[PDB]
Amino acid sequence: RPGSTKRRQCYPKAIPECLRESYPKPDQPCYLYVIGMVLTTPLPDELNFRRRKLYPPEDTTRCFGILTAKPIPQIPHFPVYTRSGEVTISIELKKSGFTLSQQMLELITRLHQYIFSHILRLEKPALEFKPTGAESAYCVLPLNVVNDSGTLDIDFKFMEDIEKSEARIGIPSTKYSKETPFVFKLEDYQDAVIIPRYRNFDQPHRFYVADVYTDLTPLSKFPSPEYETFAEYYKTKYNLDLTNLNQPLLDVDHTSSRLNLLTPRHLVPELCAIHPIPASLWRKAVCLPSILYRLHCLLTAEELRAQTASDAGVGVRSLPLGPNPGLILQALTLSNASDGFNLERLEMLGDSFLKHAITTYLFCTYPDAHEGRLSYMRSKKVSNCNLYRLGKKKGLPSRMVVSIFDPPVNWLPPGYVVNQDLHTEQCIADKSIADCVAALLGCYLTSCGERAAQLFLCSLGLKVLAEKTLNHLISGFETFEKKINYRFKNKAYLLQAFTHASYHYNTITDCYQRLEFLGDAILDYLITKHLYEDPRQHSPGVLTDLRSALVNNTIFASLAVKYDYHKYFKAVSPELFHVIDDFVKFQLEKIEVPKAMGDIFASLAGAIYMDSGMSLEVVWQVYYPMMQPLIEKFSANVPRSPVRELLEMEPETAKFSPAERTYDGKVRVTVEVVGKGKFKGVGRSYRIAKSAAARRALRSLKANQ
RNA sequence: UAGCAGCACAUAAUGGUUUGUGGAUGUUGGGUGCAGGCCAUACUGUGCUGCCUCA
């Protein structure tokens, strides 16, 4: 069915408008952004398994910039988890409206290719570098501080120095002899990336210089147990005799192959070529895939924020408000993506508000439609099928984050195309598109409030926007008004709330059932909002359990008895009065629960809502003090089924019999607890019977402990 | 800068199970649809490893 988990569809991935076709043209105005990088949380030495020097990216004058033909909007700063620790990223406009020559742009584009293909090794046989034909068409370039002024600019000199360098295309062929011996220069290695010249010619392993040992030489002990000395190693493995046996040695670390950094995890110089790119900048280069991916994700979320501010009138189109893009990115992120956050909390809050908004809308729009009809219409509008259609129509599927980020497998680098797919497409379930709509509703509710959430629903396409007889029938309700600490402006709502359909003496209001319908959705929403806002910050699963336990007709009947509602209840059914009296007796001492007692509890919420001028707050002021002891009790001790509690205590030893239908239509169930006895329960249903059996067993087990 | 094999978690797939829920031929409740919680087979990713390439 449409809106089911069992139905899956493929969608193309959205690329933000500001990155699409964004290739700088010769002699045309362009934008230069700086990637600001600050080490905000250093990694503990215990997790730094080599105890290597942490490198704050900010300690170094060279960085990267983004060159684009289109402006990038402000996005929240975001963390990236490097081997140094948590680095906060800023994307800052440095220059706007400047021009580049064909030669300058070619130099940038060649270096940009060189980064993704040669440095990062993200060019694969399935990928082609076509910067003018690529959908995501921006260049990344080196920036440096000009003349120690602190001012960053395009380091054209460094790009040209890379182009003149023979070390760009492969390993330099410069062999040292006794006539031209190797001379070590310390300055050339302090921030170097090096390439060993004697091995792995197709895939030269690159290393950072981590340190320079001035106390160690080629005649010193080798790190592999296979060779005694560095000189012996190079002679034995590659037939290379060293010209300078007194040169210092380099302590080296591999260049990182891990390019997903969005979450926390928890040699002889003479035989090396210097790669023209410094190690500081190369450490920054390794972050580019995660940075550009995160940038892409946040830009997609901001595009959706700005679109919703246009379509719904909710927020401001450009910020100097609407939700933070990080919360939209949360509502777009499935738990499968593993990104440290997910939509599930926002979804549940959204669902509760959605019910309320539609219920209120239906109640007010259809003043003559009875409860069962409003309930039926409600059930169709809130369906996963309808919500999927709305989410598809809004173009959410292309914007969702579905899978775990993996640069070489599912990410297309800027200026590349796919040779005709995990790079360009994603497969999504119809239900997940429905769940995302509710999470977005929860995002707009939490950030912008209830009116803004209603306008958001309207933007999706959901339409969400006698007296003597009265005084006689309400006689004595002044004591009830005092008990609930609320006084009605219009006592007809109070009468309606306490009028059963059997109570034909009321000819001046309807029965309670319409106000019951309205009150049900109000109480669900208010309780859910309160549970979501709870300082304990309950998990998605626990929120579901608490919502289920608190939003219940049995609890509402129990409260209605505790707050004397049964004394004001207007009915003409002796049988209903007996069932109520038996339940009232059982509740006063601490058996069928009379539905009508929970229904009038909801109906009075509906009454107060209408009498207060649609004030949810006034309802909550009345109901919160009544419910608080239960909200505290269940939020302290998240509730359980007695059958589940028995199965948790006795998983292999507790076996339940089949349902035996007794002669009175009632179900009987036996639970056998191996070695501990057989306990029978009876009730009108298998669970009242199985729960009664499980409670008798649990009582016996707890008594024998 | 590589491959593989164990163990933790996330995750979709095919089966079952269980709570909720719906109009239904509804002879007095087993037909199907969508959600949660579990049990089983099987996939990927990250991580704790283990063996094993180059150094």
Numbering used by the authors: 501 to 766, 795 to 848, 1052 to 1151, 1305 to 1349, 1411 to 1535, 1558 to 1672
Quoted from the paper:
Vertebrate genomes carry a single highly conserved Dicer (Dicer-1) gene (Jia et al., 2017), which encodes a ∼220 kDa multidomain protein that appears dedicated to the miRNA pathway. Cryoelectron microscopy (cryo-EM) of human Dicer revealed a protein architecture that resembles the letter “L,” with a complex helicase domain at the base, tandem RNase III domains in the core, and Piwi/Argonaute/Zwille (PAZ)-platform domains at the cap (Lau et al., 2009, 2012; Taylor et al., 2013; Liu et al., 2018). During miRNA biogenesis, the PAZ domain, which has a strong affinity for substrates with blunt-ends or short 3′ protruding overhangs (Lingel et al., 2003; Song et al., 2003; Yan et al., 2003), binds the base of a pre-miRNA stem loop and the two RNase III domains function as catalytic “half sites,” each cleaving one strand of the double-stranded substrate (Zhang et al., 2004). The helicase domain, which has a clamp-like architecture of the RIG-I family of RNA helicases (Fairman-Williams et al., 2010), is located near RNase III domains and is composed of three globular subdomains: an N-terminal DExD/H subdomain (HEL1), which is separated by an insertion subdomain (HEL2i) from a helicase superfamily C-terminal subdomain (HEL2).
To understand the structural mechanism by which DicerO can support both RNAi and miRNA pathways, we used cryo-EM to analyze this murine Dicer isoform in its apo form and in complex with a miRNA precursor. Although the structure of DicerO in the apo form could not be determined due to its inherent flexibility, we were able to determine the 6.2-Å-resolution cryo-EM structure of DicerO in complex with pre-miR-15a. Importantly, our DicerO-RNA structure captured DicerO exclusively in a cleavage-competent state. The overall structure of the DicerO•pre-miR-15a complex shows that the helicase and DUF283 domains had faint densities in the cryo-EM data and could not be built into the model. A control experiment showed that DicerO on the grid was intact suggesting that the weak and missing protein density is due to their inherent flexibility in the cleavage state. In the cleavage-competent state, the PAZ-Platform cassette anchors the 3′ and 5′ ends of the pre-miR-15a and the RNA is accommodated in the positively charged groove formed by the RNase IIIa/b domains. The dsRBD of Dicer interacts with the RNA using its α-helical face and contacts the minor and major grooves of the pre-miRNA, whereas the β1-β2 loop binds to the terminal loop of the pre-miRNA. The dsRBD clamps the RNA in the catalytic sites of Dicer and the alignment of the RNA with the catalytic sites suggests that mouse DicerO cleaves pre-miR-15a between bases G22 and G23 and between bases G37 and C38, producing a 22-nt miRNA duplex. We conclude that DicerO without HEL1 exists in an open state that allows direct loading of precursors for both RNAi and miRNA pathways.
